[model samples]
Target: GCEEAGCPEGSACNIITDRCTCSGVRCRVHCPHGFQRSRYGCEFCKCRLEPMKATCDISECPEGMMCSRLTNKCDCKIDINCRKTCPNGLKRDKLGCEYCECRP
Candidate 1:
């Protein structure tokens, strides 16, 4: 609600800690090793090692995105124009391009 300490676009308020962190960040209070906040502010992140790659928690990314090849951050889909709102009122969900409520 407040600007300076507002919850970010992909984060929420932590009920227990009363902080504007990701909802999963609260999970860190319960599980330490399996859960920690990423520098991006995502929470409840578990450390995972890719079979042929480095360690990273790939799930931190929202839908239609993937972990970057050079970093632990998520990357957008390869062929699609990842940034703008879909022209036909489409909202990207876990998989991608789900329809949004049509605006009047």
Candidate 2:
């Protein structure tokens, strides 16, 4: 019996605090197209109305070539070797293994 609208779905209202809360209820996540859940879920986790989204992959490149999510295809930039020299916070460019660039 939830008393508030913001409570997670399938949850109940707290008798003492009068706020919606989850006890035995498990939160379920369903995202819209082009979106995916970004975090783990549990009874205590707050439900999200919207999720994060990202994509990329590649094939046909030599075994060492890295793939890019941007083009959804294999390329040299994401290659493992180029990434080895990348600085702590920077990552390989999405276009090719030309240079290391800061991750966006």
| C-alpha local distance difference test of each model | 0.43, 0.40
Which lDDT tens digits does candidate 1 get at residues 8-104?
Answer: 6666644223467555443334342334334333445454333313443557777766654324356435345444454455344332222343323
Model 1 segments more than 4 A misplaced? 1-24, 27-33, 36-41, 44-76, 82-104
For model 2 the local lDDT of residue 15 reads 28
Give the C-alpha lDDT of model 2. Answer: 0.40
- Please write out the lDDT profile of model 2 over residues 1-103, one tens digit for every residue: 3434546656554422345543533434443432221111112334434432233444555576654332335555443333434345444342423454554
- The true-structure Cα RMSD of candidate 2 reads 14.4
TM-scores of the candidates in the order shown: 0.24, 0.26
lDDT of 2 at 39: 16
- For candidate 1, the lDDT comes to 0.43
